[PDB]
Design an enzyme around this catalytic site. Sequence first.
Site, short mmCIF file in Angstrom:
data_model
loop_
_atom_site.label_atom_id
_atom_site.label_comp_id
_atom_site.label_asym_id
_atom_site.label_seq_id
_atom_site.Cartn_x
_atom_site.Cartn_y
_atom_site.Cartn_z
N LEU A 171 0.81 -1.22 0.00
CA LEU A 171 0.00 0.00 0.00
C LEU A 171 0.84 1.28 0.00
O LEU A 171 0.41 2.30 -0.52
CB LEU A 171 -0.95 0.01 1.20
CG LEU A 171 -1.97 -1.13 1.39
CD1 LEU A 171 -2.58 -1.06 2.78
CD2 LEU A 171 -3.06 -1.10 0.32
N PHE A 198 11.77 4.02 5.89
CA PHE A 198 11.97 3.12 7.03
C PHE A 198 11.22 1.80 6.93
O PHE A 198 11.28 0.97 7.85
CB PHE A 198 11.61 3.85 8.34
CG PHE A 198 12.38 5.12 8.56
CD1 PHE A 198 13.76 5.10 8.79
CD2 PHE A 198 11.72 6.35 8.55
CE1 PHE A 198 14.47 6.28 8.99
CE2 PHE A 198 12.43 7.54 8.76
CZ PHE A 198 13.80 7.50 8.98
N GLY A 199 10.52 1.59 5.82
CA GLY A 199 9.81 0.33 5.59
C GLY A 199 8.59 0.42 4.70
O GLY A 199 8.49 1.30 3.84
N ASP A 227 1.57 15.22 15.77
CA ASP A 227 1.63 14.99 14.33
C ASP A 227 0.22 14.88 13.74
O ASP A 227 -0.07 13.97 12.95
CB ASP A 227 2.46 13.72 14.04
CG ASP A 227 3.07 13.70 12.64
OD1 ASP A 227 2.85 14.63 11.82
OD2 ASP A 227 3.79 12.72 12.34
C1 LIG Z 1 -1.44 3.72 3.13
C2 LIG Z 1 -2.77 3.01 3.01
N1 LIG Z 1 -3.32 2.45 4.11
C3 LIG Z 1 -4.51 1.81 4.07
N2 LIG Z 1 -5.07 1.25 5.19
C4 LIG Z 1 -4.51 1.28 6.45
N3 LIG Z 1 -5.19 0.89 7.56
C5 LIG Z 1 -4.43 0.98 8.71
C6 LIG Z 1 -3.13 1.45 8.50
C7 LIG Z 1 -1.96 1.73 9.40
O1 LIG Z 1 -0.97 2.31 8.97
N4 LIG Z 1 -2.03 1.32 10.67
C8 LIG Z 1 -0.95 1.38 11.50
C9 LIG Z 1 0.04 0.39 11.47
C10 LIG Z 1 -0.02 -0.78 10.52
C11 LIG Z 1 1.12 0.49 12.34
C12 LIG Z 1 1.22 1.55 13.25
C13 LIG Z 1 0.23 2.53 13.27
C14 LIG Z 1 -0.85 2.44 12.40
CL1 LIG Z 1 -2.13 3.70 12.44
S1 LIG Z 1 -2.89 1.76 6.81
C15 LIG Z 1 -5.17 1.71 2.84
C16 LIG Z 1 -4.60 2.29 1.70
N5 LIG Z 1 -5.22 2.21 0.42
C17 LIG Z 1 -4.49 2.61 -0.78
C18 LIG Z 1 -5.26 3.68 -1.54
N6 LIG Z 1 -6.67 3.35 -1.72
C19 LIG Z 1 -7.38 3.91 -2.86
C20 LIG Z 1 -7.00 3.19 -4.15
O2 LIG Z 1 -7.45 1.84 -4.09
C21 LIG Z 1 -7.42 2.51 -0.77
C22 LIG Z 1 -6.59 1.73 0.25
N7 LIG Z 1 -3.40 2.92 1.82
#
Ligand SMILES: Cc1nc(Nc2ncc(C(=O)Nc3c(C)cccc3Cl)s2)cc(N2CCN(CCO)CC2)n1
Length: 261
Positions: free
Chosen positions: A16, A21-22, A130
């Site tokens: 995604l 950093f990853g 942030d």
């Molecule tokens: C960057 C991203 N994340 C998505 N969902 C997430 N849910 C929770 C997330 C998160 O980072 N949790 C988290 C973690 C894991 C560790 C520490 C702290 C935290 Cl808070 S990231 C969906 C998404 N999409 C791409 C673009 N789209 C449109 C085109 O299809 C739809 C879907 N992109």
Amino acid sequence: PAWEIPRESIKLVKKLGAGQFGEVWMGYYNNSTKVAVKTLKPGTMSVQAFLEEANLMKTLQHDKLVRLYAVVTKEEPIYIITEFMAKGSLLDFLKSDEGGKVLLPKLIDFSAQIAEGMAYIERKNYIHRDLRAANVLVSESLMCKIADFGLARVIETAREGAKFPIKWTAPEAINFGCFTIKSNVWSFGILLYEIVTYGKIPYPGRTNADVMSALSQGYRMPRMENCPDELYDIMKMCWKEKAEERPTFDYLQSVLDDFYT
Ligand SMILES: Cc1nc(Nc2ncc(C(=O)Nc3c(C)cccc3Cl)s2)cc(N2CCN(CCO)CC2)n1
């Protein structure tokens, strides 16, 4: 603790995002539960500091905050596993053709949901530091949830590779190093601008240094096109020069829950 899970009980499916950093993946815990996985790229960050976020999320658990589910910290490739938010970040969502069709009643609903999550953080004696549209995530059912707790702290310090969002940060936090829940309120006001303008950058065409300089001169962003006076007064309250004279997050959640549209 019992936050540790075996690696095998996690299948990574779709990439995604990619940072310095990853990486961030959508995956599955035990086939059943849809999850999001953050991957630590070895050596770039310390494993200590990468997990600092999760350790904080262990103690920070509310409906309007992205929930931690588990970690994988036994061998090289470190995972943080959380609640999955289908629509991605609020910023990106607002800029999409779908979000561009989301009207003002629902936009004000978004901001209230965030003010609720921040009311919890306030009540828990923590600070986020942030708070911006890029760090809020949207679910399928269009629930907004606060994400990215890298800069978050308990009151009464910065993690590796950190970096504050200059344009979202209160002047007293920039100039005097004074981060409080009231500097988060400043951030929230900037976040309100981001919501009403559909993900526009703060202070268009201005550099961070121009911003810092302009704020010390008493500049606030003028009323934005297609933003009702009542909403602008709420933003203005958040950008009060004197920190102690900025409203509580409990007040913001109440007044936004109370704005009809
Ligand atoms: C960057 C991203 N994340 C998505 N969902 C997430 N849910 C929770 C997330 C998160 O980072 N949790 C988290 C973690 C894991 C560790 C520490 C702290 C935290 Cl808070 S990231 C969906 C998404 N999409 C791409 C673009 N789209 C449109 C085109 O299809 C739809 C879907 N992109």
